[PDB]
Amino acid sequence: SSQIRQNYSTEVEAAVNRLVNLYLRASYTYLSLGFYFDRDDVALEGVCHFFRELAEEKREGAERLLKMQNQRGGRALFQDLQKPSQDEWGTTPDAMKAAIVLEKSLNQALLDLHALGSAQADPHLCDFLESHFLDEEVKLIKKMGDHLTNIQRLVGSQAGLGEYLFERLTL
Amino acid sequence: SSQIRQNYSTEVEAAVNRLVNLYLRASYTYLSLGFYFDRDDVALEGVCHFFRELAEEKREGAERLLKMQNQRGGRALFQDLQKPSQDEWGTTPDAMKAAIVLEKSLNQALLDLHALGSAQADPHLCDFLESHFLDEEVKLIKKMGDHLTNIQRLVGSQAGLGEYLFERLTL
Amino acid sequence: SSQIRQNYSTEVEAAVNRLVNLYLRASYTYLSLGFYFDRDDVALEGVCHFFRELAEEKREGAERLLKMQNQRGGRALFQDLQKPSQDEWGTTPDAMKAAIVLEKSLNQALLDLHALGSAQADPHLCDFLESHFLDEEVKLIKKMGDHLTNIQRLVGSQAGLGEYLFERLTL
Amino acid sequence: SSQIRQNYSTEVEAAVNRLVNLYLRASYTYLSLGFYFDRDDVALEGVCHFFRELAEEKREGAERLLKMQNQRGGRALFQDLQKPSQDEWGTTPDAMKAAIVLEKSLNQALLDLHALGSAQADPHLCDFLESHFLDEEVKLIKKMGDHLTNIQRLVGSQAGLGEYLFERLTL
Amino acid sequence: SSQIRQNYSTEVEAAVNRLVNLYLRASYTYLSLGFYFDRDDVALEGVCHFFRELAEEKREGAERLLKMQNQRGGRALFQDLQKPSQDEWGTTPDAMKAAIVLEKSLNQALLDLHALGSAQADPHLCDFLESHFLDEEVKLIKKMGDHLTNIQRLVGSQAGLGEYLFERLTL
Amino acid sequence: SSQIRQNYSTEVEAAVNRLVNLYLRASYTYLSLGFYFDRDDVALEGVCHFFRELAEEKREGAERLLKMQNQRGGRALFQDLQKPSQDEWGTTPDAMKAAIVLEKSLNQALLDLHALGSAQADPHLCDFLESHFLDEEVKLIKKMGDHLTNIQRLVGSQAGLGEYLFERLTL
* Cβ pair E149:D40 closer than 8 A: yes
User: What does C31-88 look like in DSSP terms, one character per residue?
Assistant: HHHHHHHTSTTT--HHHHHHHHHHHHHHHHHHHHHHHHHHHHT-------BPPPS-S-
Q: Is F164 on the interface with E (CB under 8 A)?
A: no
Round to whole Å and give the CA distance between E95 and E93.
5
Distance CA A102, CA A144 (A): 11
Q: What are phi and psi of B81, to 5 degrees?
A: -105, 110
**Residue D56, annotated as binding a ligand:** yes
Helix (H, G, I), strand (E, B) or coil at F118: helix
CA–CA min distance A102, chain C (Å): 12
User: Do F155 and F95 touch, CB atoms closer than 8 A?
Assistant: no
Instruction: Please tell me the distance from the alpha carbon of residue F19 to that of residue F62, in angstroms, as a whole number.
Output: 8
**Is A60 labelled as part of a ligand binding site?**
yes
Within 8 A of E97 by CB-CB distance, chain A residues are: none
The verdict on a CB contact (< 8 Å) between C41 and B1 is yes
What is the CB-side half-sphere exposure of residue E136 using CA atoms within 13 A?
14
Between CA D103 and CA C1 the distance in angstroms is: 50
Q: Nearest-CA distance from C168 to chain F in Å?
A: 10
Residue F90 neighbours by CB distance under 10 Å: 12
Technique behind this structure?
X-ray
User: Across the interface, which of C134, C145, C148 has its CB nearest the CB of E123?
Assistant: C134
Tally A–E CB contacts below 8 A. Answer: 45
Closest residue of chain D to E147, computed from CA coordinates: D43
- Determine the Cα–Cα distance for residues A124 and A130; give it in Å rounded to an integer: 10
Could you tell me if C55 and C30 are in contact, meaning their C-beta atoms sit under 8 angstroms apart?
Answer: yes
Q: Is chain C in touch with chain B: ≥3 Cβ pairs within 8 A? A: yes
Residue in chain C lying closest to B62 (CA): C31
Say yes or no for a CB contact (<8 Å) between A154 and B168: no
As a three-state string, the secondary structure of chain B is: CCCCCCCCCHHHHHHHHHHHHHHHHHHHHHHHHHHHHCCCCCCCHHHHHHHHHHHHHHHHHHHHHHHHHHHHCCCCCCCCECCCCCCCCCCHHHHHHHHHHHHHHHHHHHHHHHHHHHHCCCHHHHHHHHHHHHHHHHHHHHHHHHHHHHHHHHHHHCHHHHHHHHHHHCC
In angstroms, what is the C-alpha Rg of chain D? 18
C-alpha atoms less than 13 angstroms from C-alpha of E18 in its C-beta half-sphere: 13
Nearest chain D Cα distance for residue E168, angstroms = 10
Resolution (A): 1.8
CA distance D123 to E5: 78
Query: C1-171 belongs to which CATH class?
Result: mainly alpha
CA atoms in the 13 A half-sphere facing the CB of A93:
13
Q: Do E41 and F1 touch (CB under 8 A)?
A: yes
Contact E145 D42 (CB under 8 A): no
* Per-position DSSP letters for F70-85, written without gaps between them: HHHT-------BPPPS
Measured between beta carbons, the chain E residues lying within 8 angstroms of D45 are 146
Residues in contact with F90: Cβ distance below 8 Å, sequence separation at least 6, in sequence order: none
DSSP-derived secondary structure for D71-140: HHT-------BPPPS-S---SHHHHHHHHHHHHHHHHHHHHHHHHHHHHTT-HHHHHHHIIIIIHHHHHH
Contact E134 A124 (CB under 8 A): yes
Question: Given CB atoms, is F77 within the 8 Å cutoff of chain C?
Answer: no
Angstrom distances, CA of residue E102 to CA of C112, E148, E163, F94: 37, 14, 21, 38
Cβ-Cβ contacts under 8 Å, B39 against chain C: 1, 70, 75
E130–A123: do the CB atoms touch at under 8 Å? Answer: yes
Under 8 Å between Cβ of D48 and D37: yes
A153 vs B169: CB contact, 8 Å cut-off?
no
- What is the spatial distance between Cα F17 and Cα B80, in angstroms, rounded to a whole number? 71
Interchain contact C/D (3 or more Cβ pairs less than 8 Å):
no
Which residues does E63 contact at the CB level (< 8 Å), separation at least 6? F31
CA E12 to chain centre: 20
The rounded distance, in Å, linking the Cα atoms of E70 and B167 is 50
CA separation for the pair D100, B107 (Å, rounded):
79
CA angle A87, A139, A170 (to 5 degrees): 65
Nearest to F39 among E28, E38, E70 (CB): E70
E123 touches chain C (CB under 8 A): yes
Whether residue A110 contacts residue A134, with contact meaning beta carbons closer than 8 Å, is answered with yes
CB contact (8 A) between residue A6 and residue E131: no
Is the Cβ–Cβ distance between C151 and C166 less than 8 Å? Answer: yes
What amino acid occupies position F110? L
Q: Give Cα separations from C39 to B125, E116, F38 (angstroms).
A: 18, 49, 33
Between chains, do D80 and A76 touch, taking CB under 8 Å as contact?
A: no
Terminal Cα-to-Cα distance of chain A (whole angstroms): 45
User: Residue E110 burial (CB < 10 Å; 0-12/13-18/19+)?
Assistant: buried
